[PDB]
């Protein structure tokens, strides 16, 4: 709907930007307050760095994916500089949070709980016919109560028919991306499941880079031989066998996110 009839447009005066949390080529991310009392995250577009329409597509996607386990869109300011205002996650990125003194002291029980929260969020995404395509610990946000939410929906896509095929020059992080997506540009919810397998290694190693000691060409070569990532240090064998299900050669053999959530909750309720 036009911005004047939109439930999301908001006068820029309602916002006060307080602390820059991040900055890059396409903009910045700040902690701020909406109408004085409500803490929010504000992502601002660096004018000219990219299309305003491309930037706002992320917000438009978040409008269609609302759930307690996904970072919530709050508002948008569609005049330059363009802003996307969302739910503020106090403990920031999971990949960074796991490295802090609080994250380091987490028991395997709580790491499993978090893994299950993520699978829960991905099961909602899966049910809505969407895919994420950038599922990795960097893209999981942590709340002040240590609950986890899926974030960074920029590459998310509604799957009309079974699969989304990227553009021929599109590049993806090799270590987190399913082989079919790397070799063919082909993404399905099963590609996200592969990524989730990789995300579980990030969780159990407190944020270490997947495939320790290997370059991308080595990872590709090992995968093509039928090998998968070596068991991470201190990883419980039950969890490692769950990651192996996520890495099944055929996409169709990989489990659903609902199956994963359910097994992960059992693992948690036992430890
Ligand atoms: C990068 C980091 C960890 C500083 N970060 N990034 C976002 C975020 C905000 C708006 C959009 Cl549209 C997408 C992500 C964010 C947030 N909500 N809460 C806490 N930290 C956040």
3-state per-residue secondary structure call for the chain: CCCCCCCCECCHHHEEEEEEEEEECCEEEEEEEECCCEEEEEEEECCCCCCHHHHHHHHHHHHCCCCCCECCEEEEECCCCCEEEEECCCCCEHHHHCCCHHHHCCCHHHHHHHHHHHHHHHHHHHHCCEECCCCCHHHEEECCCCCEEECCHHHCEECCCCCEECCCCCCCCCCCCCHHHHHHCEECHHHHHHHHHHHHHHHHCCCCCCCCCCCHHHHHHHHHCCCCCCCCCCCCHHHHHHHHHHCCCCHHHCCCHHHHHHHHHHHHHHC
Among 43, 41, 53, 51, which Cα is nearest to 92's? 41
- Is 25 annotated to bind a ligand? Reply is yes
Method: X-ray
28 is in an annotated binding site: yes
Taken in order 44, 47, 50, 55, the sign of the CA dihedral is positive
24 in a labelled binding site: yes
In short, whether 71's Cβ falls inside 6 Å of ligand 1 is yes
Q: How far apart are CA 128 and CA 54, in angstroms?
A: 22
**At what resolution in Å was this solved?**
2.0
Question: Does 56 contact ligand 1 (Cβ within 6 A)?
Answer: no
Separation CA 174–CA 42 (nearest Å): 29
User: Token pair for residue 1?
Assistant: 């709907």
**Domain locations in the chain as residue ranges:** 1-88, 89-270
Q: Which atom of ligand 1 is nearest to the CA of 90?
A: 19
Determine the CATH number of domain 89-270: 1.10.510.10
Question: Is 1-88 a domain of CATH 3.40.50.1820?
Answer: no
* Ligand 1 nearest-atom number relative to CA 22: 4
């Amino acid at each position: 709907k036009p911005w004047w009839e939109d439930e999301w447009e908001v006068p820029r005066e309602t916002l006060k930007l307080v602390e820059r949390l991040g900055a890059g080529q396409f903009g910045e991310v700040w902690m701020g307050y909406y109408n004085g009392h409500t803490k929010v995250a504000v992502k601002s577009l660096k004018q000219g760095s990219m299309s305003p329409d491309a930037f706002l597509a992320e917000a438009n996607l978040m409008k269609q994916l609302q759930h307690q386990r996904l970072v919530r869109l709050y508002a948008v300011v569609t005049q330059e500089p363009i802003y996307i205002i969302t739910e503020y996650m106090e403990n920031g990125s999971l990949v960074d949070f796991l490295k802090t003194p609080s994250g380091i002291k987490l028991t395997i029980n709580k790491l499993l709980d978090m893994a299950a929260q993520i699978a829960e969020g991905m099961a909602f995404i899966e049910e809505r016919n969407y895919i994420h395509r950038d599922l990795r610990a960097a893209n999981i946000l942590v709340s002040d109560t240590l609950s986890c939410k899926i974030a960074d929906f920029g590459l998310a896509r509604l799957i009309e028919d079974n699969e989304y095929t990227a553009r021929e020059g599109a590049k993806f992080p090799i270590k987190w991306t399913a082989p079919e997506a790397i070799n063919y540009g082909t993404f399905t919810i099963k590609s996200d499941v592969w990524s989730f397998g990789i995300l579980l290694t990030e969780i159990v190693t407190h944020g270490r880079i997947p495939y320790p000691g290997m370059t991308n060409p080595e990872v590709i070569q090992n995968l093509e031989r039928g090998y998968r990532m070596v068991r991470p240090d201190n990883c419980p064998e039950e969890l490692y066998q769950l990651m192996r299900l996520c890495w099944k050669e055929r996409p169709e053999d990989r489990p659903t996110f609902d199956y994963l959530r359910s097994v992960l909750e059992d693992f948690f309720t036992a430890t």
